[PDB]
Amino acid sequence: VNSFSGYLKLTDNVYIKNADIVEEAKKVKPTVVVNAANVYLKHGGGVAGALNKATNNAMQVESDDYIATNGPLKVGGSCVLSGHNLAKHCLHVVGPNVNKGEDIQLLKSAYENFNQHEVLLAPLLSAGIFGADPIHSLRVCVDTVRTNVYLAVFDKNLYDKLVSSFL
Numbered sequence: 001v002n003s004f005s006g007y008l009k010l011t012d013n014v015y016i017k018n019a020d021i022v023e024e025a026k027k028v029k030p031t032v033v034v035n036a037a038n039v040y041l042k043h044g045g046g047v048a049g050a051l052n053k054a055t056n057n058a059m060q061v062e063s064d065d066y067i068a069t070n071g072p073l074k075v076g077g078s079c080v081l082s083g084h085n086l087a088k089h090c091l092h093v094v095g096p097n098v099n100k101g102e103d104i105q106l107l108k109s110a111y112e113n114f115n116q117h118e119v120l121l122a123p124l125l126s127a128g129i130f131g132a133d134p135i136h137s138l139r140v141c142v143d144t145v146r147t148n149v150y151l152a153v154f155d156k157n158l159y160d161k162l163v164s165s166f167l
């Protein structure tokens with residue numbers, strides 16, 4: 001048993017809810033929250049900007065030190081950093097950004113990072129301002145992630161569309 005509430009069950013291991021991932025993280029304090037990161041860990045907008053704002057910018061301070069030491073992530077890659085006040089850990093995962101012209105085929109590689117963690121709270125990778133089709137992102141998630149993933153979908157109309165189209 002775990003502390004996630006009100007999720008619709010999609011598969012053996014994938015669950016979904018219409019929720020603000022910031023508010024969900026604050027309530028659950030999961031072991032792992034996933035950030036929809038970029039390779040520079042520049043958290044100004046979207047989930048990255050919302051998560052970072054909820055940490056009072058401590059996520060961005062930590063991330064700038066990580067980049068100064070290690071250099072940028074790869075598209076499809078990830079790193080584990082602090083979860084600050086939201087979670088034990090934050091898994092920063094870089095899905096391809098279609099609006100920057102990155103290869104959508106890297107989405108599967110991005111989701112494979114989730115398999116290193118038994119349970120995660122996560123957004124859909126490469127959807128929203130990332131420019132990929134969220135229906136596609138959900139299909140890649142279910143076909144790639146084998147660990148238990150709790151997906152938070154911010155947009156109510158998109159949540160309803162994802163559930164009603166899910167195969």
Ligand SMILES: O=C(O)Cc1c[nH]c2ccc(Br)cc12
Binds near residue numbers: 123124
């Ligand atoms: O949860 C959503 O509504 C869509 C979504 C999934 N991933 C996202 C990343 C950024 C932004 Br902005 C939105 C998204």
